[PDB]
Amino acid sequence: SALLAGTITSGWTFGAGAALQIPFAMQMAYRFNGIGVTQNVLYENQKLI
């Protein structure tokens, strides 16, 4: 549950160094960029997700 904490809240940086403060709406916008999806899909469809 400590690793379930920092994955949802603190981002991807908790194991690579000191923990940042990343909001959850800004996590999945940059997790779509690895698979080739921009930020147009997340912010409009956020009620459907």
Next chain:
Amino acid sequence: SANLAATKMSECVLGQSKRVDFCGKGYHLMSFPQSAPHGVVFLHVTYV
């Protein structure tokens, strides 16, 4: 199996992977580990 599990705790949970059929089927979003007796249960959030 534990070295496969310690890789997927490092790659899938603590980071983002572009892989297919490693962090789960489809495009990888994030992974949620859960506690299990004599093992570990992964929850793979995928993009289909």
Next chain:
Amino acid sequence: SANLAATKMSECVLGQSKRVDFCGKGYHLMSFPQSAPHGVVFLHVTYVPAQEKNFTTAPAICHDGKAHFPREGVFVSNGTHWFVTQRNFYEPQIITTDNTFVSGNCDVVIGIVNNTVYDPLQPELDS
């Protein structure tokens, strides 16, 4: 263990790998192999950030009624002006149309703030 040793000689040493807790903890730069008895001592050069500062964010910037989405970067603020920086370092920049992307309106974005997007072509018309 030798198949895990030859994997780190191929992936970490010979090229750049994006893997986490494989080529060493943190962001991978390079790897230096060193020979030992019955093994290779690895030297992992890593990129670790240190000093952090809390900033004020927002997902989008509303200007003319259309939402301005960031292309590559984040939206930060010091409490007065909104800056465009990156995730790995602090380099404040003037907000331009080349660093922003126009999609949608301002109504469907939760948390959108109002600012003035600077167009560099507008002072260059009369000058």
